[PDB]
Design a protein around this ligand. Structure first.
Ligand SMILES: [Ca+2]
Ligand SMILES: [Ca+2]
Ligand SMILES: [Ca+2]
Ligand SMILES: [Ca+2]
Lengths: 90, 90
């Protein structure tokens, strides 16, 4: 069923990228950018530079540790899901 | 991409069941029971009765309104993803 497939992909996608550099269960700035470019390309705006990307990183990383953990990653995904829920995305 | 479709599917699955009866943007008892049974079957335990089910309902229904809105449904989904993000589910 797509929903369990969907939940599984959501979890899977986190590790596919988190365990490449450093802490294997957190996404560093480099790991987060590849995940967004490769997996959520439909959502990217027109600014692809590191400065623009850094602003976003700062938004997700609640506990301020220059990394995005799984908890933080789900929050982000839910925020995306809710945004897509409105009449007009944004 | 997998993650994008996954998000799409998380959002649209909600509305495929919530709009069946009454408030079209919230799941009642029947709509939620249908959503779990048809979309998350791998996650079903042994008991299918009303009392075991309403136990789950009341946990999902944070705002006490006897129904599951989209926000509560996202929290539900986040929780499942975290459980799955363990060595032993549960
Ligand atoms: Ca990492
Ligand atoms: Ca963090
Ligand atoms: Ca309803
Ligand atoms: Ca509710």
């Amino acid at each position: 069923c797509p929903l369990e497939k969907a939940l599984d992909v959501m979890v899977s996608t986190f590790h596919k990228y988190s365990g490449k550099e450093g802490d294997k269960f957190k996404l560093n700035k480099s790991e987060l950018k590849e995940l967004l470019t490769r997996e959520l390309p439909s959502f990217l705006g027109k600014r692809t530079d590191e400065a623009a990307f850094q602003k976003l990183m700062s938004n997700l990383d609640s506990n301020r540790d220059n990394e995005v953990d799984f908890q933080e990653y789900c929050v982000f995904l839910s925020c995306i899901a809710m945004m897509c829920n409105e009449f007009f995305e944004g």
